[model samples]
Target: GSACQFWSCNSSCISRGYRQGYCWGIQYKYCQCQ
Candidate 1:
């Protein structure tokens, strides 16, 4: 993983080719990948 954005429209990652999505909790989106 290169970097983790707090609000990347879906927690988009920079190392994951900026095409990843995930969740951190309910009632919210925390997409993270790399």
Candidate 2:
């Protein structure tokens, strides 16, 4: 999740061709790709 902080899982995920994606992480959140 490079720019997950500004990314939207519901939109950018499928829009980017991923089956699914979620914002997750410890100190910094990142796009979790599925």
Candidate 3:
């Protein structure tokens, strides 16, 4: 997989009505919905 894992989660969050999303947590392995 790629180093940046944001696009998928980012878009998904938006689909769910979130303004944006991103990788967070240890080693950037988590998604933040906001």
Best by lDDT: 3
lDDT of 2 by residue, 1-31 (tens): 3645534774667787777776765454446
**True-structure RMSD for candidate 1:** 8.1
Which ten residues in a row are the worst by lDDT in model 1? Answer: 1-10
The local lDDT score (0 to 100) that residue 30 gets in candidate 2 is 47
Global lDDT of each model? 0.52, 0.62, 0.77
Q: What lDDT, from 0 to 1, does candidate 2 have?
A: 0.62
| Residue 25 lDDT (model 3) | 47
Per-residue CA lDDT of candidate 1, range 1-34, in tens? 4244345644457555776555454455346463
Question: Candidate 3: misplaced stretches above 4 Å?
Answer: 1-4, 27-30
- Candidate 1: the clashing residue pairs are 22-31
- On the 0 to 100 scale, the lDDT of residue 5 in model 3 is 75
Taking all chains together, each candidate's TM-score versus the true structure is 0.23, 0.42, 0.54
